[model samples]
Target chain A: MISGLSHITLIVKDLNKTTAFLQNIFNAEEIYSLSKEKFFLIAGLWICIMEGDSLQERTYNHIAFQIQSEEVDEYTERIKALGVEMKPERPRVQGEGRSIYFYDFDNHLFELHAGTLEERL
Target chain B: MISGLSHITLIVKDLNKTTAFLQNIFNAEEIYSLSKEKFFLIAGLWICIMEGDSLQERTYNHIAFQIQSEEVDEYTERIKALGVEMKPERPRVQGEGRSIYFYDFDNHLFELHAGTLEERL
Candidate 1:
């Protein structure tokens, strides 16, 4: 049985640019890289970025990341400062959770979520 | 900067079947679900499956999960027994480690990888 998530792979257009963005935004430390591929450790998870043609169409399907609720404003400002698109804050009830959705250079949607499983459920 | 990955959301047609597959194949424990979405914890990470439109075309762009080398055959047999498509193993050098790529019921590609950062590099 799977023990836990091992790594995530994202296809991007420019390897260097995407890598830089990752380093700046996620503080990911570069672990390895080849011609068209690279790996980094962010929040102790291996994130693999590879070069691909393009995603012709896009969707809300995304990868969400965990962060403390207190840091939501800071992350939102950091992301906004980087000029990433800020999806309108999703409507929320008292305890569901909070999320900030944004796209990467290649139209890949990513999310920052501030909530725990117990809190969410 | 981001701390770590929070969860992965996959779009599937049959929430019940996919949820079951996730449980049997990965030993995921369901944490929550509603009419169109469900959540499970597999390998200590949250995996969310949502009901949605089908993906018309699939690609190698997939998620690779970590596992020990000794368990590869068992996982392969289990996955195959479920009648899921078994992708040919990706060729690798001795130290590069090994990977099994396959498609879920909805053509979503997933990987069972037996490799580490040190070995991969």
Candidate 2:
């Protein structure tokens, strides 16, 4: 009986740092904030960041959001300016569009992709 | 530069069990599948489930999905039938709508919420 997505939550070590990253990189507007939790609207979805210990490993368990191919360079620079670390780009085919892989302050991987599932498949 | 949600990926311990949970509970349409990963469409959002080591902790790191109020009780019974663990219901105010918190076999927390940000706020 699921209707649609409500929110995606992330456990992070530093709430302020995560919030700053979301604001600067994604232009996520803060909806509300408590002592250790933040709720923001980013790319038409609610993404929550809460204070917790850092993650221990990296896997394909990541979230990807759609972005425009023309803005890939702009987004990359913004991510770089935030002092966040970037992961090496994965191989892509010519018609597959662009993507940028990066790690958040707490080591959660995120993808900013400029392609559709239909196109990729 | 972000446009919208592309997908939300979950790290689970059992691929088949988690896949069954999604199929029976949410009726998520299986779009693609591999040995250790699955792609499904639930409520029009692409959800990815992949096999991984168990999550070490829970700290508000959860995902919520919109559901109808009348379906809340039905979903609770379905979750119970699956023998999944249920978290005790949290306190709610009048007119706030209903919610059911439950844990998957992998110990991941999910909430089926029957409310909106505007109504809750």
Q: Which candidate has the top score in TM-score?
A: 1
Question: What do the candidate models score in CA lDDT, each in turn?
Answer: 0.80, 0.80
Candidate 2: misplaced stretches above 4 Å?
A34-36, A54-58
> Just chain B of model 1: what TM-score?
0.93
Candidate 2 C-alpha lDDT tens digits along A1-121: 5779877778888789788888888889999872578788997787777787845556555788989888888888877877788866675787888888888877677888888876766
**What is the TM-score (0 to 1) of candidate 1?**
0.92
* Residue range B23-91, candidate 1, lDDT tens digits: 988888898773589898888878899887745467556788888888988898888899888886766
lDDT for B2 in candidate 2 is 75
Weakest 10 consecutive residues, lDDT, candidate 1 chain A? Answer: A53-62
